[PDB]
Design an enzyme around this catalytic site. Sequence first.
Site, mmCIF file in Angstrom:
data_model
loop_
_atom_site.group_PDB
_atom_site.id
_atom_site.type_symbol
_atom_site.label_atom_id
_atom_site.label_comp_id
_atom_site.label_asym_id
_atom_site.label_seq_id
_atom_site.Cartn_x
_atom_site.Cartn_y
_atom_site.Cartn_z
ATOM 1 N N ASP A 25 -41.024 -39.142 31.291
ATOM 2 C CA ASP A 25 -40.409 -37.907 31.598
ATOM 3 C C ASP A 25 -41.017 -37.337 32.846
ATOM 4 O O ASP A 25 -42.131 -36.817 32.748
ATOM 5 C CB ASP A 25 -40.583 -36.957 30.455
ATOM 6 C CG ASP A 25 -39.669 -35.724 30.472
ATOM 7 O OD1 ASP A 25 -38.998 -35.383 31.452
ATOM 8 O OD2 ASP A 25 -39.611 -35.035 29.455
ATOM 9 N N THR A 26 -40.338 -37.243 34.009
ATOM 10 C CA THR A 26 -40.931 -36.640 35.191
ATOM 11 C C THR A 26 -40.919 -35.125 35.182
ATOM 12 O O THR A 26 -41.633 -34.457 35.942
ATOM 13 C CB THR A 26 -40.205 -37.181 36.398
ATOM 14 O OG1 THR A 26 -38.827 -37.206 36.039
ATOM 15 C CG2 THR A 26 -40.587 -38.597 36.749
ATOM 16 N N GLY A 27 -40.201 -34.453 34.284
ATOM 17 C CA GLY A 27 -40.234 -32.969 34.235
ATOM 18 C C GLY A 27 -41.089 -32.434 33.090
ATOM 19 O O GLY A 27 -40.785 -31.390 32.519
HETATM 20 C C1 PSI Z 1 -47.221 -25.141 29.728
HETATM 21 O O1 PSI Z 1 -46.209 -26.128 29.998
HETATM 22 C C2 PSI Z 1 -44.879 -25.643 29.811
HETATM 23 O O2 PSI Z 1 -44.595 -25.342 28.398
HETATM 24 C C3 PSI Z 1 -43.822 -26.331 30.782
HETATM 25 N N1 PSI Z 1 -43.197 -27.484 30.107
HETATM 26 C C4 PSI Z 1 -42.944 -28.732 30.496
HETATM 27 O O3 PSI Z 1 -43.225 -29.183 31.598
HETATM 28 C C5 PSI Z 1 -42.252 -29.574 29.401
HETATM 29 N N2 PSI Z 1 -41.072 -30.225 30.021
HETATM 30 C C6 PSI Z 1 -39.838 -29.758 29.740
HETATM 31 O O4 PSI Z 1 -39.658 -28.863 28.923
HETATM 32 C C7 PSI Z 1 -38.620 -30.292 30.504
HETATM 33 C C8 PSI Z 1 -37.490 -30.786 29.573
HETATM 34 C C9 PSI Z 1 -37.741 -32.202 29.026
HETATM 35 O O5 PSI Z 1 -37.804 -33.090 30.210
HETATM 36 C C10 PSI Z 1 -36.693 -32.489 27.879
HETATM 37 C C11 PSI Z 1 -37.078 -33.793 27.160
HETATM 38 C C12 PSI Z 1 -36.318 -34.034 25.866
HETATM 39 C C13 PSI Z 1 -35.223 -34.912 25.805
HETATM 40 C C14 PSI Z 1 -34.572 -35.131 24.581
HETATM 41 C C15 PSI Z 1 -35.019 -34.491 23.414
HETATM 42 C C16 PSI Z 1 -36.106 -33.607 23.474
HETATM 43 C C17 PSI Z 1 -36.762 -33.395 24.692
HETATM 44 N N3 PSI Z 1 -35.274 -32.538 28.338
HETATM 45 C C18 PSI Z 1 -34.365 -31.603 28.012
HETATM 46 O O6 PSI Z 1 -34.625 -30.609 27.349
HETATM 47 C C19 PSI Z 1 -32.914 -31.832 28.447
HETATM 48 C C20 PSI Z 1 -32.376 -30.636 29.250
HETATM 49 N N4 PSI Z 1 -32.143 -31.989 27.202
HETATM 50 C C21 PSI Z 1 -31.236 -32.962 27.022
HETATM 51 O O7 PSI Z 1 -30.988 -33.812 27.867
HETATM 52 C C22 PSI Z 1 -30.581 -33.014 25.641
HETATM 53 C C23 PSI Z 1 -31.383 -33.921 24.714
HETATM 54 N N5 PSI Z 1 -29.242 -33.543 25.737
HETATM 55 C C24 PSI Z 1 -43.185 -30.586 28.698
HETATM 56 C C25 PSI Z 1 -44.338 -29.886 27.950
HETATM 57 C C26 PSI Z 1 -42.400 -31.415 27.661
HETATM 58 C C27 PSI Z 1 -42.698 -25.374 31.309
HETATM 59 C C28 PSI Z 1 -43.249 -24.157 32.110
HETATM 60 C C29 PSI Z 1 -41.729 -26.095 32.275
#
Ligand code: PSI
Lengths: 99, 99
Positions: A25-27
Amino acid sequence: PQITLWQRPLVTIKIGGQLKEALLDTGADDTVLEEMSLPGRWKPKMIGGIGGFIKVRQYDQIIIEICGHKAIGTVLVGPTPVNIIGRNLLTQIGCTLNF
Amino acid sequence: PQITLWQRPLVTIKIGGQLKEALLDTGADDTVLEEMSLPGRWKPKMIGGIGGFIKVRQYDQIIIEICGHKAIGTVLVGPTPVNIIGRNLLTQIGCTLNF
Ligand SMILES: COC(=O)[C@@H](NC(=O)[C@@H](NC(=O)CC[C@H](O)[C@H](Cc1ccccc1)NC(=O)[C@H](C)NC(=O)[C@H](C)N)C(C)C)C(C)C
């Protein structure tokens, strides 16, 4: 290997004497794995996502083998729907995005 | 270009006469943008993530320019925390994961 993105980029990890499938996962900044049997001690912590914030348990120093390369880092085990290898381990095996 | 993953892989998109920043995400099947001014018609739909499920609005056929390449697809505008470009547009501009 070059992975194209027509299907979810899934890979096999060994962690704990146990084998599983994880999504590159790159995001994701953190590596989050669904509930599993890991030993030692750990801290509470909280991670954000789309649609939510979850409480996870933080472990440091783990042995993770990802597609045959080894790495050591922080693994957060909690209620994710899918295993996610994030940007802290991905750098360690050298993955890069190219387009 | 080759992107390494020591920082979040963020890129510029032009969509709707407007410029924004989006994260290239290999673990997101659908492209989800936070709330913005788009015209036409659309359907209700619901997407899953970590921590939950959200109600989003689905547009088809959109003009998205991602880092100078053009592409046309389904864009889901809804309550994400960050703009996510997902696997449906990412294949259209050719990105691949390599390690
Ligand atoms: C402190 O860190 C934070 O809480 C930060 N979080 C992050 O960087 C977090 N990344 C993330 O939160 C970025 C999102 C992930 O890449 C998820 C992965 C996923 C796919 C399928 C099922 C479940 C999950 N994709 C999705 O939610 C996509 C939009 N969903 C879909 O494609 C659905 C399954 N059809 C990681 C911790 C996981 C936030 C500020 C961006």
